[PDB]
Each structure stands twice: as structure tokens, then as C-alpha cells.
Amino acid sequence: AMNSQLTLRALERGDLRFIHNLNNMSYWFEEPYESFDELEELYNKHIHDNAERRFVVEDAQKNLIGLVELIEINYIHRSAEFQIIIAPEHQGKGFARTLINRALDYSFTILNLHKIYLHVAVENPKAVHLYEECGFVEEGHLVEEFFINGRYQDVKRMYILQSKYLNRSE
Amino acid sequence: NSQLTLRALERGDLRFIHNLNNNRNIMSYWFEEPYESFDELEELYNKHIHDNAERRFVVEDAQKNLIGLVELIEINYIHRSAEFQIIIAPEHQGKGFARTLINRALDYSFTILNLHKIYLHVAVENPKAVHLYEECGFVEEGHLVEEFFINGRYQDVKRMYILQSKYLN
Amino acid sequence: NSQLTLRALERGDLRFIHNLNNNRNIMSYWFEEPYESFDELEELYNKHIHDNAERRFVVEDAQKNLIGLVELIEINYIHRSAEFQIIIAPEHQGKGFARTLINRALDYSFTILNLHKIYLHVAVENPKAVHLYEECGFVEEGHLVEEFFINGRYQDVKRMYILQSKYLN
Amino acid sequence: NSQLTLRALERGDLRFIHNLNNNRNIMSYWFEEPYESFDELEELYNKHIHDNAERRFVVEDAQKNLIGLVELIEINYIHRSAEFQIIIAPEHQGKGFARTLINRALDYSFTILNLHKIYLHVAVENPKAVHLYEECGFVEEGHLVEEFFINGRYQDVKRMYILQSKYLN
Amino acid sequence: MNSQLTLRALERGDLRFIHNLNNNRNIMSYWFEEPYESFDELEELYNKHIHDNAERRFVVEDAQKNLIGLVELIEINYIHRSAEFQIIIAPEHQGKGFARTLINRALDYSFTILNLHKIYLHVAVENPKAVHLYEECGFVEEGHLVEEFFINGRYQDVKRMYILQSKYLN
Amino acid sequence: MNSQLTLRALERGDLRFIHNLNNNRNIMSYWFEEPYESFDELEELYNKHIHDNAERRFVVEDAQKNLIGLVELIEINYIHRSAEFQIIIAPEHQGKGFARTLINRALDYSFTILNLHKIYLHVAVENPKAVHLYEECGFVEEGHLVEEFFINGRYQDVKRMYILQSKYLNRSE
Amino acid sequence: MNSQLTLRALERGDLRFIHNLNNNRNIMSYWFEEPYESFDELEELYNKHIHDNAERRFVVEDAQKNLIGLVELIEINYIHRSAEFQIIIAPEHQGKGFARTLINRALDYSFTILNLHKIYLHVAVENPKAVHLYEECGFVEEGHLVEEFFINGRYQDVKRMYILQSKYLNRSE
Amino acid sequence: MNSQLTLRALERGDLRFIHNLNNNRNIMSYWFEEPYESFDELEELYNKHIHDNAERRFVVEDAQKNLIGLVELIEINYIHRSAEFQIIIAPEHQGKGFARTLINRALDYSFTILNLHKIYLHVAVENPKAVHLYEECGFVEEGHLVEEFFINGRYQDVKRMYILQSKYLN
Amino acid sequence: NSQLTLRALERGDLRFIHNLNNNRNIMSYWFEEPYESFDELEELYNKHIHDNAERRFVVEDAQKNLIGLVELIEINYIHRSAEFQIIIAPEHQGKGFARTLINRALDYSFTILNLHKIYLHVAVENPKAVHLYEECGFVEEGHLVEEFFINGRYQDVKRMYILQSKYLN
Amino acid sequence: NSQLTLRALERGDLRFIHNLNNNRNIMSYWFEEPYESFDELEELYNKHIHDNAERRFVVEDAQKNLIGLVELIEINYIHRSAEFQIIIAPEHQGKGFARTLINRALDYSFTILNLHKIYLHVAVENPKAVHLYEECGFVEEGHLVEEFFINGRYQDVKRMYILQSKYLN
Amino acid sequence: AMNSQLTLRALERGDLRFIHNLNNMSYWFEEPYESFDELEELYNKHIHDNAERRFVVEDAQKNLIGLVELIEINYIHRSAEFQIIIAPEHQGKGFARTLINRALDYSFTILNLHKIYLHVAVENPKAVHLYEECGFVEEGHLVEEFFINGRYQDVKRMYILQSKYLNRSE
Amino acid sequence: NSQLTLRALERGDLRFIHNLNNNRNIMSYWFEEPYESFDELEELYNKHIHDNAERRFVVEDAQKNLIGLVELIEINYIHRSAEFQIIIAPEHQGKGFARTLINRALDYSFTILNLHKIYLHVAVENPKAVHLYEECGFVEEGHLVEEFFINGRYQDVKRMYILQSKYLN
Ligand SMILES: [Mn+2]
Ligand SMILES: [Mn+2]
Ligand SMILES: [Mn+2]
Ligand SMILES: [Mn+2]
Ligand SMILES: [Mn+2]
Ligand SMILES: [Mn+2]
């Protein structure tokens, strides 16, 4: 209900600590990093690169809630992959749908992308169902795609198109 | 209105420009490069300090409150033309400052930069703004079809111009 | 016409581009920066090699003769638009190539770059050119007043556009 | 087929890669950056020489004729996967080299790089290619909707994979 | 009042004052023949030309260190031994009789320290009182430049006036 | 003859010629307001100012590509829209009547391509023939600069002469 | 008094003082043969020449750390083993008898630490009191340079005075 | 012979000749007050000081382009308007009467082009014939520098001789 | 003596080093380059931070008072030798520290750096110092004639060495 | 012991690392480059930030006291091996933390980095350390003769290893 | 017998092709490379680095025979690892012992190292025996150290000391 | 002997210097940095072109054959001293050139550089060389014990000097 006070803002240098705290292997523009020091240098290097865009999510009190990321952005095919990360202490408060809507809205009314896709573990059917409710549809079931917790797991690939998100209600 | 001033934009004004871009909530550009992050804006600012293709001015009142921004872009010094954009901070909209800012901009453009022509774009769906520009002496020279993707759809804009010869009489 | 090809511009083609600019005898630009000397053109070329705001193609025949140039400029990948200019070498003007080149340019723009809109400027005093563009599907969206200083006086130009939806159907 | 060899790509092979890109006539990429001119390709090459994310092999015969190219991209060394593309030079298409190249690539991927999975994309509108990949042991894991803008329209592609366990048994 | 006016070499800390002088005057200002508007541009042009001898500047102060004005020598040529001189007095100090004193300080510097041969200046034809003041200080008209400067919405004529080292020293 | 004179933008390969022109004249030459003497200094000043718009130069060639002379615009200011012009003809081509043609080419460029408002030049007071030539091409004296230049052992006066875009373009209208 | 004068190598924090000394003297000052006027130019010339051995400078302080003056060696050549010396005392400390002491410190440094062979200086012909002071410290006139320097509106002559290491070190032996 | 001698600005292609002149002369040579020995060092000092105006050099050629000598102006000061002059004639061209002509060319350049006020030079006290030649060309002794230069195993005295622009021009 | 420690020199110690050089009143060197100003010393320090030809240590007591400096220079890792210099601050001279410092330096040189030989120079006119070095195991290997210009005249110095084999037994 | 944690090393930890190196009092290395001063360590740190060959973890308790350091060096990601060193701060030596740290390191090495082998070196003259490692599951694979010059003499060290298969069963 | 004509020379840029041909995963200063282009850049980067030293082996006719490498050189411990690689076409001609002697001689009479060690596959007992003949002694048997041909293999670590190689005959 | 000349070393002589180092077969240094590869020598050469601490001269005959090298190193311009080394190419040894080269070097050192003292090192085991130096006026000032590791063992060298005052009489 009280998701009204969540704001998105473009990621900046001061947010790197938070990003570092969030990851428990991460990448910055497809380059791996572990230390905050490496992340700092990778950040300076890619500041003008348009292949990935990030937004930190804050509440009215400026607490850092989570992160919205678009990666693999291609401006000819007009597509991007989307990932959302909510800080542990803010999980389970119902913010996810709101953040997903903000991300799609940005992608489809500002960047003018045509398609957005994402990956979700097959073993997290609750998350899969949440994405289906937000209008995503399964386009793939990737077999043994990611090595997580000691074994290769399958993931769903789900997408939504700009035409669908914008004209859903017409 | 009499106490509104223009001053050349400086690094310390960038936070304000960044705030104007967040509230406005469309993609903003610095020397034709889109920016989102304050850090990207700051780097684009340092890179183009010596570039004359765009010039910007902040608008302040007698008390130094930041009112808005005046921008000249696509400046070409052979054809002597430029595009003009004006942005008033939300809290200062509706107070009658617009005409004043437009006059300041034209005055600068035509009595200091010595430009020949100034043009601007205004949404077709904002006929009040179109009418305001017509009152300040601008005339429609084009109706650009599906020129800008704004708020989820391609929109048409009027292109309006005024010439130095007209303004200087 | 069937044997005309477009190929991405390369450093070795700059001599040709420079020759086209001399006979045309108007101020030429490379990424919105004016140039006159071959050396300035070469340096602007090296500087903008990775810049996606402009794309150029040389036109060749089956025998590799250099026919002309196709340029897309002001490319904006959010609004998905670009401005188009075409230049045919003097000795190849009047051979019927223009329509073919225009089609190749639109095809590239709309089936490879995935742009939404392409526009161009054409002198009002060249109504034959205007008519040719109308035949290829372009429509006037503006009549720009005293937009360009050409041959000693400010001239009006038509601004003409075509949309991807129209060209693809 | 027995006499086909793979060799790690070097700067001298860039001409060949550029030639392959012209015939295919869709936008090509070098480490996810698009390029059209040989000059752009050469610069992107110098820039990514130390980058592990993509690896390429040129295919030659006993006489050193250039047959084609094998590319692994989006290589991830933790998940141990990569995307595979194969490009055969026009003059060598239809001669039965494809299956051999595919086998060489899988062998390399699975017995030398020690990858776990190899996947590829194939246009839904090219069912003969899809069928060939199914014969080589690939299986469909996705049907990507309107994934790529190719020839004026968004097209669907199949995503097909093969696992190291399957190929090695 | 006038005996206590001093010239001192312009320094980085004075640029704010120079910027304020440019805002009040409200015509396009130049630094090493490059126009500037923003304080940032002025500061970068200042850093870039610190070792360039084609222009030299001095701030004018009183006994209490109030900033009175600026003296500039530009187009300095050390073979022909000439330079252009410009003087700008802050609004609040105009009309107080400082000008003649500043002009003499500038000529003294030019002719007894830099060893220049000639100093010239430009003065609007529409400011005959200024022209006459320069004539009183020993300058003579050598040209009447037609529509030389676009100032305040129109091309204006300016007098070009000069004085020679031999005249000022004898 | 004069119909066949062409202007082209100066390029690096023309610098030898420019250097030769400077040696014959035998007075101090400048490139972007910096004096130069050696070819090497000229070449480095050329590389340094390639993208600087305050000066523009053109070499003059005939139908056979012989190098005839040089046209320079300096002190170009794009707000006031003015520039200084200098023309130099190679010794062996002086006295063939090319000057007026080159002056027309320069004015035409300045006023129909760069869109400048005013062009001025300096001419030695002791070269009244040159002053007269400039007056015929439409220039008018706007100053007589006293002891402006140290040339050949003494300070000399020069005329400053100008012409406006309105006059050159619309004289006939 | 003079026993308590110390020399120390010039440092960045002393540049304000050097700048103040230049303003009072009111003639053109140089740093590594480059003239400077603003503090900012002096600071950049200082940063640029930090590792340049052609000039060396020392500030003079008293027991209380007040800044008294400056000792400079310039044109140092380590093959010919010579250098030019200049000494500048702050106005408020002139006339207290410090000069001879500073000159001795400078000679001592030059001849017992740098191992130079010769030290020379310039003194205005119109400052015969200074010339006499230098003669007392062991310097001898080796030239009377005619119209060498343009100072205060006219070319002035200066004496050039020198002293050799052998004389300063072994005079007493 | 002498009417056909020309001065031209030194260029990179002349450095081999300058290096040969330094080897034959067999004393330590300087470029912008820095000693050089190797051609490589000379070439780097040349590149580094191309835009430095404190020294200017000219090679002397005959009608057939044979390299005759070198004319150098050093310690050029554009406020006091003075410079030091050095002339070096290639061994095979010494004794042919070129010197006076070269000296006049150098003074002419200095005084009718650079607009200098004074030119001075150094000449070994042990070469009174050279001293006398300079006196004939209008130079006057202004100093006798004691043990100024360590040359050929010993400190040597040199005369310092000067000439003024007013004298040479009148 | 037991409470004297050696620690690797750091930027914050440069003031102390500079103070030692002023009272000693002879030309000092940093990596064979002479210095006088603190600023020159600081720049030489930044430049040679990774240079292994010289190593320095400050000597402190239990209370962290700065006692002196130990320097190894001309370090050659093939011949395995180095030159040693030791400087004790004026106020700490005559307290018996010298022998202790010499032992610490040799210990470092021979048990950590693994050098084979350490040598030093000592003025012939300081026979007390020479005798102290002989007591610590050094032996004269040369009497260098007029090696150093010090206090207005060329002075002879003894060169004294000790070998790792001797110190370790 | 239960409350000991490992945390990836950062720039702010360099002081601590430098303190550990002073107490050990033998030559220390950062990516195989020796260092003594904090300044050298800081420069070597900046230089190797992107280098994968060594990884470090600081050990803290619940209250954030700095206990020690765990280092993996000579990491090879193909052969999947690394050399391990552990350093405990003097004040925490002898309190029983060692075995716990060793277990944490093996666990990390074998369940997170997926290494195959971990080896270490231990002085032959420190048989209690050797015995402790044998108890933790390491086995001698070499006795390296006169491998390290430590405290004035070349000393032998045991090389001890443990394999992932052994630790995980 | 005719090993007398083998020469060692320090590796230089032109030898990189040969080094590239020799490797069938290699490293340059412990940094991995595959392409010749990467090797070129790594070469430029480490030219002044003393941690590794390489020598190419040539015959009288300048054929490239092989490579001698010292790596992990530490100048405090005074040790290094040695590797020798003979080009396929030159294997089996008896050159190895000669190259090993050249390497030890260099290491022990020029670099002044104290110890040299090497690694040899346990499954290549012929090579192990050759090294024992040249004076090396086993100091370790590394268990499952290297993944070669589809499985982890054991390797011997063998060393020789300077004192032994130099005084063997006394 | 009369026709032997010195000339300042230049880049084109480096191959010769490299050849001299290969035949001599001991570790060579350039500005105290050891070099082996021609590429390392070339980079050290470019780096120290402006460094005055060492000066070198090649020796040529009338026919331009390269005879040898004269080097002054450790040049100090305050103490006015330098170390001298001379190397004659193998094929030119034994022809009586040595005395001549020594005289050329001393002459340069003492009549051009104005040095005060020149010293050199000569193996104790080469008494013929020692005697030659004594004949040219040098005197032993030291017998350095185990100073250089040459040919597998530490060797002693004589240090010999001569002063400018002596040579200039
Ligand atoms: Mn990707
Ligand atoms: Mn634009
Ligand atoms: Mn100017
Ligand atoms: Mn000087
Ligand atoms: Mn290692
Ligand atoms: Mn040394």
C-alpha cells in the first residue's frame, strides 16, 4: 500500500558501498569484481557506457532499499535484461511489484525499448508466478544454465514487449 | 520579473540541473549526449566546458533562489542559428516568469551573440505554450510529425522561429 | 542501378569525400564540426571513429568507381530518428542514380538500424529535388525560413520526412 | 572435411572477418560493440585483445584457403557456458563443411575449454538450419519472441543447447 | 584618493571579481582572444594561458584593498613592441576620477618596465567624453574603425588611439 | 589565365611552399600569432592549430597545379564577424595581374561561405600602388596606423582598409 | 644580530615572500630565465623547475624565523664552474648591516659546498655604494656593460664583478 | 664569393652538419644552455626547444648550397632587447673572408628584423686577431671576463664586446 | 641501546631527514641525485619509491624519538654489495648509540637482504670514527685520495668493508 | 573460535598488514614484489588491484578486533591450486585460533573457490608448526633444500598439501 | 658431439613468433596469453622486469632450436625455476644436456644465484634420469600438481645448488 | 694510433655495444641497470639520453671500423670525479690501441669535462693491465676485497686513480 514513497535515482559513486554490500559473484559491465576497490575502478571506467543502466531505490527517509538494473541493452534490437535486488532487511514488504512497474515504465516510456526480459530460477516458482502477474511470459526454460548452491539449475527466461505493457488497458 | 537575472552556468549549479532533470522525468542531454547519473553529468560538463555549440544560463531572483534554466543548443556560427529551451523549476511555474525569460534569452541571442535566428520546439498538445510563444513574436515554420518519443508515444511538435531583424525592431 | 552498392566509409575514402566537398563549394561538416582541409577532415575522422551519431557510406558501381556518398547524421537512438544527406559526384549526376540511392539509404535506416523516422532538408529553390523526394515517399513537415546562409543570402528549406511504418508497408 | 583446421584469430585475419560481415549484411559486433567499417573493427580489436569473453577461430583447408569462422561469445568461466556462431564464406556454403565445423567446435569447447554448455540462436524462419542443429545434437530450450530486428521486422529465434555430458557420451 | 591606487598582477583569487565585472558590463568578454561566459571557462582559460605573454593583466586596489578595476594589455607583440590596452573600472568606482591615474599607471608600466614602443586602444565613437579624456592623457586618433564591434544590438564604430614611448617619456 | 586560378584549403604538403614564400619576403612571419622561422617550427605550429578556427588559409593554383600564392584570413571573430586578410603571391607570379582575382576569391569566400560582415587589411603607407589597388577592389581607408610595424630597420605606418559584406554583395542590387 | 642569520633552501611555502620582494622592488623578475608577474606564474615556474640545477635559492631567516631576504645563484654551469649571484633584502631589513653577512654565506656555500670556481654579479653603475660594498667583500670589476638593462625608463650600465674560489678560500693561507 | 652567402633558419636536416661542426671544434657545445655530445641528445634538445624563442639559429650556405657555417643568437631577452651572438665557420671555409659578411648578416637580422637594441659576444683574449676583427666591424670591448671558460685544459679570459642598434643603423 | 629500533622510512619521516641534512651541512643525495629543498626531497622520494638500489631506515627509541638514519646505497644484487651511511641526530650523538646502530645495519644487510659485502667511507681526518669501525669488524681496503670536496678542500677517505661470512661467524 | 570471521581485504586494511609484516621481521611480498615501507605497500596494492593471482582475508572477532590474515598466493585457475599462508597477530598467538582459521580457509578454498589443491611451506626448524599442519590433514610432499634465506642462513622447508577430495570426504 | 655450435642469446621482440609457435597454456611473467597479439603487449609491458629471464638457442646457421627460461627469480633467496623447451624438429638430437649446462652456468657464474630448481612429470622417468645425470636431486614429489591430458599428474621437483655445480670437480 | 677517434655514442651504435656485451660474457649495465636483451638496452638508452651521470664514446679508425668503447660512469659534478671503463672489441685487442684510448679519455675528462679525478677498477689477476695503467700515470688507492662476482667467484680488484693536476703537467 505505502509503496508510494519509493523513488528511483540514477546510480552514482556514493552508492557503490551499497552495491558492494548487496552482492553475496557480481559483474560490472560484464567484468567480474570482488573487492570494493575493483568495483570503484570499474565504475570510473564505464561511466559513459550505455550498455547497462542502474537505479538505486530509496524511501522517504533515504534508506537504501534495493537496486534496479538494465543490462545487455542493445539499441538496434531495442532490448534489455532486467534484474532487481532488494536488500535483505527490506524483502517481504511487497515492494517488488512496484519496482518492476517502475523499471518497465522507464524502459518503455523513456528509453523507448521494445522488449525486456529476465531470468528466474525454476526452483523459485513463487518468483516465476510474480513475474507472470506483472505481464511477463515464459520464452525459454534454460537447462542447467547456472551453477548455484553446488549444482547446475534450470532458469526460466521471461519477457514482455513495449506494445503489451503500454496498451494492456486499451 | 524585473529582478530575474541570467548568469552563465557553473559547476556548482549542476545539482540544481540534476534536480530539474529528475522532476521533469524525460531523458536529458548534455551536448547531445544523454545523461542520468550526476556523475555522468559532471563528466560531460568537464568535457564540454570549451565547446561553443551549446550555452546555458541559470535564472536567479534577487534572493538567489534558482528559478530555472535557459539553454541555447545546436548553435551554428556560420548560419547563425540556435535552438532554445527553457525550463522553469516546478515550484516557480505559473508565476509569469516565462515571458521574461524568453525576452532575456532573445536579447542575449540577438544583442550579444549576434545570432540571426532562434528556433524552438513545443509540443502540439501544449497549445497554451504555443500561444505564449506566438505572443513573444515566434511563428510556426514546421509541424514535426512523431518527432519525439515522450511519455510512451511519438508526439508531434511545432517548430517556431524568430529572426534577429524582427526582434531588433 | 541494380549494380550500385553501399559500403561503410573507411580512411582510404577520405580523399574522395574531400573532392566532393571542394566541387560542392559550401561549408562542410564532420560530426557537426566544420572542415576545409583534408588534414582537418582526417583528424576529425580519427576522433569520431567510435561515435554513433553519424554513419556514412560510399556508393560504388560494379567496377568500383566512386559514385557518391550517403550520410546519416543527428542519429538519436531513443527518438529513433536521423537526418539524411546524399551527394552524387558531378560526373555521375543525371544518370538516374538518385532514386536508387535514396531507396538504399532508407532501406539501411529502416531494416538495419531500426530507425523510426528519417528526415532531410532541401532548398526551396530546388523544386525538382523536392518533387523527387515526394515521389520517393517523403512529405513536407516544415518550410524553414532563412535557415541557411548559401550563396550570399539566407535561404528557406523544406524539411521532409518519412516513417519506418510507411516505408515498410 | 578431414583437412579443415581451426586457428586462433590474429590481427591479420581482420580483413577476412570484415569480408564475412559485408556478405551477411546485418549489423555485426566485436565484443558487443557494433561496427561497420574495417577501421572501427580494427580499433575494437585493439581494445579487446585482453578480454576473455569471446574467442574466435578461422577455418582453413590444407592449402590455407579461408573457409569460415567459429566464434564463442558470452563466455562465462564460472557457469562454464558460451554462445556459438559459425560463419561460412559464401563460396564455401553448401559444400558440407558445416557439420564438420560444428563437431570441431564442440570438441574444442568440451575437451579443451572444459565448458559445460554451449548454446546458439537460429532464426525460426530458417527451419533447415534449425534441423541441421538438431541433427548435430542440439535441443531447443527457448523460442525467443521478437528478439532480433532483422530485415525490417522483429523475428523470433530458437535457442538451442548441448551439454558436455551429452557430447562426451 | 589617487596616490593610494596600486596595480598588482592578476591572480587566481581575483577571477571572481573579474567575473563580476563581466556580468555587470554585460557584453561578451575575452581571455586570450577566446570568449568566456562561465566562471569555469574563465578559470580554465586562466590556467591554460598562465605562461602566455601575449596578454598581461593587473588588478587595481586602494589602500584598504578594495577592488577598483582591471588593467589589461593584449595583442602584445615583442618585435614591433606594441600592445592594446583596456581598462575596466567597477561600477561603484566609476565617476570618481580614478581613470586618469590608472591610465598613467598602465603607460608607466608599459613604457618603463615592459619597454614597449607603442600602446593603442579602442573607444566607442558614441562615447566622445571618453575619447576626449584619452586625448588629454596624450593619445591621438590614428583610425576610425567602421562597424568593427557588434555591441548592444548593432555594429559600432570605434576610435583607435595611440601613444608612443618617446612621447610619454619626454 | 585568371579564370583558371583555384583556391584550395591549405594542407600539410603545402608548407614547403609557404616556407619558401616567407624566405623571399624576408620579414618576420606568423602562424596563429606565433612567429616562426624554421620549417620545423612552421610544421609544429600547423599541427598544433589544425582545429583552431581563428585563422583559415588557401593555396592558389593554376590549371597546371603550379603554386601561385596564398590567401590568409586571420583574427577571425565569429561574434563581431570580422577578419583580417593577407595575400601573398610568389615572386615569379607577381606582375601577371592575378592579385585582383585572388582578392575577389577571398572576398567571395569570406562573404558567401563564412558569412562574415567585415574584412580588413593592412598595407604599407610607402606602397601607394598597393593602396590604390585595394581602393579599386572596394576597400576604404579606416585608419593610418602610426609606426605600427618595425620593418627593414624602422617603424613604418600602415593603412588599415576595410570592406563590408553589404557592400560586396549588394553593390549591384 | 648577524651571527643568528640562517640560510635554508627555498621551499614552496616561501613563494609568497619572494612574490612580496618582487612587488616592492618594482622591476621585472625572472625564474629560470622566464619573467613572471603573478604569484600563480611564479608557483607554476617553481613546480616546473624543481629538479633543474641551473639555479639554486636560499631564504634568509633570523633567530625568530622572520624572513629577511633571498640569496640566488643563477646561470650555474658545472663545467666552467661559474654562477651569477643576486641578493635581495626585504625593505624593512635594509640598513641593518646584514648584507655582508649574507654575501659571506653565499660565497661560502658556492665555494665550499658547490665547489664552484667563480661567482659573478651585476650592480648598477648608478649605485656606487653597492659597488663599493662588493669591492670590500673581495669582488673586482671585470666589465662595465653599456646599456645592458632597461630599468625605469632608460637603458642603464652595470658593472659586472667577480671573485674566484682560490681567492676566497686561500686568501688567508 | 660573399654576395652569394645566405642565411636560413636552421632545420632538423641540418643537425648532422651542426654535430660535425661540434666534433671538429672539440669543445663542449650547448643547445639552450644544455650541453650535448651525442647526435641523439642534440636532436632531442632540438625537438624540445622548437618553440623556445630564447635562442635562434641560422645555417650559412653559398649559391651551391654548401654548408659554410652557423649563426646563433642566444640569451635573447625581449625586454632589455639584447642577445649574445656566436658564429662558427666550418674548418674548410675558415680563412676565406666570409666572417665579416656573416657578421654583417647577423647584425642586419638582429637589428632590422628582430628589432633588438644590443648584441654582444665573447672572444678569447688569446685570439687578438679575432678581437681586432670585431672592433673593425663596430664592436667595442665592455668587459674582460677573468677565467670565465674552462677551454682546452685551463680557465681562459674572454673579451665581451658589444654593438648597439643605433650605431649599426646610423 | 636495547630499545633502539629500525623502521622502514616513510613519507612522514622526510621532515626529519631534511633536518638532518641541514645541520650536517654538506651536499646530500637521494638515489645519487643531489637535493637541498624539502620539496626536491619529496619529489625524489616519490620518484624512487619502487627503486631497490637504496634502502633507508629511521632509528627510534622506546618513546618514538627520532634518533638517526641508516642508509644502504649502491645496492647491487648480483655482486651482492652495498655502501652504508649512518647519521645520528646531533642531540643523540655521544650517548653510545653508534655501535648498536652499526650492528643493526649489518644484521639487516646480512640476515635479511642476504648481501655478501658492506662497505663505507670515513674521512681520514676522523681517526676516532675509523677506529670505531675497526672495532665493529671493518677493515681498510682503500685510502681514496682527494675523493670528496668537503669544507673547502679535497679530502681523503678510508674505504672499509666487512663480509657476510665474517659477520655471521 | 565460533565468532571468527573472514573478510576480503580492502585498502583500509593495509595498516594492519603492514603491522603484521613488522613483527614477523623477514622480507614481505605483495604479488611477489618485496616491500618494507607502508608507502611501498600502498603503491603495490594500487598496482595489483585487478590481479587474480593472490587473494587475502582479514580475520576479525565479533567485536571487530583484528586477529590475523589468511592469504592464498600463486593461485592457478587451470591446475586449481594455491599456496596458503596464515599470519596471526602477536597478541592473539597461542590462543587456539590457528586450527579454526585453517579450517575456514580450507572450507573456502574447497567449497567456494573450488580449488583442487592447497599447499604451504613450513620451516623444518619449526616442527611444532609442521605437526599442527599434519593434524589438520596436510601431508609432506617435499623437503625443499636451502629454499629460503632466513635469519642469516639458508633453511629447508617442508612443502605440505591437502586435496579437495580428501577434505570433502 | 657437434653441440659446440649452439648459442644463447637474450630474447628480443623478433623472437616472439617462435615463442608463440613453441607453446601447445603459456604464461608471460605469470600472466596468461593465447594470441600472439596478447604476447606482444605482455612483452612490451615486462621488458624491464627481472623476475624472469629468457634465452633463445640458435645454431651456426641461425635456426631457432629452443628456449631457456628462468622464472620465479628471487634475488634475496637467490633462487629460480628453470624450464627448457626444444622445438619438435630438433628434439632427440642430444642438445638438452648442453642447454642445461649453459643455463646452470649462466645462473651460477653470471647471475650469482644460489639455487636452481625445476619440475618434471613423474611419468617421464627418462627426463627425470637425465636431470639426475646433470646433478639435480629430487626434493619433492608433488601429488596431483598438474592437470595434463585429462588427469592430474604428479611431478618431481629437482634442484641443484651453486656450490655443488661450481665445486663438483674440486 | 694517431687515426683513432672518439665520438659520442648514438642509437646506431647500440648493436655494436650489444655485440661487445655478448662476447665479453659478464653482466653489463646501462646507468647502473643490468641489461641483456637488445630491447632492454634500447629502452634504457632512450630513457637516459638526458642523464649526465654517464657519458660514452665509440672508438673508430680512419675507415670507420668500430674498435671499442670508452665509458665514464658515476660522474659526480660536485666532487668532480668519475669512474672509467674501456672495452676494446676482441678482434682489435693486442694492437697497441689501449694506451691511446686511455690518453683520449683522460684528455676528454680533464680538458673538456673539467673533472678533478678519474678512477678505475682492474682485476688483481690481470697484473699486465695493472702495469699498463701505472705506466699511463694511475696509482693504486685501494685493493677491493671480493668486490665483484666474475666467472663463478668473488674477485679482488685494484682501484686506481689519477688527478687532473697530475695529468695537466
Ligand atoms: Mn553480453
Ligand atoms: Mn546536432
Ligand atoms: Mn590577435
Ligand atoms: Mn642564461
Ligand atoms: Mn610466482
Ligand atoms: Mn652509483
From Swiss-Prot, chains A, K:
Description of activity control = Allosterically regulated by polyamines. Polyamines trigger conformational changes and induce the symmetric closed dodecameric state of the protein when they bind to their allosteric sites.
| Transferase is among the record's keywords | yes
Q: Where is this site: Could be important for selectivity toward long polyamines?
A: 81
> What residues does acetyl-CoA bind to?
84-86, 91-97, 124-133
Stored SUPFAM superfamilies: Acyl-CoA N-acyltransferases (Nat)
Q: What is this protein called?
A: Spermidine N(1)-acetyltransferase
What Gene Ontology terms describe where this protein resides (cellular component)? cytoplasm
Amino acids binding spermidine: 30, 38
GO terms, molecular function: diamine N-acetyltransferase activity; magnesium ion binding
Q: In which pathway does it act?
A: Amine and polyamine degradation; spermidine degradation; Amine and polyamine degradation; spermine degradation
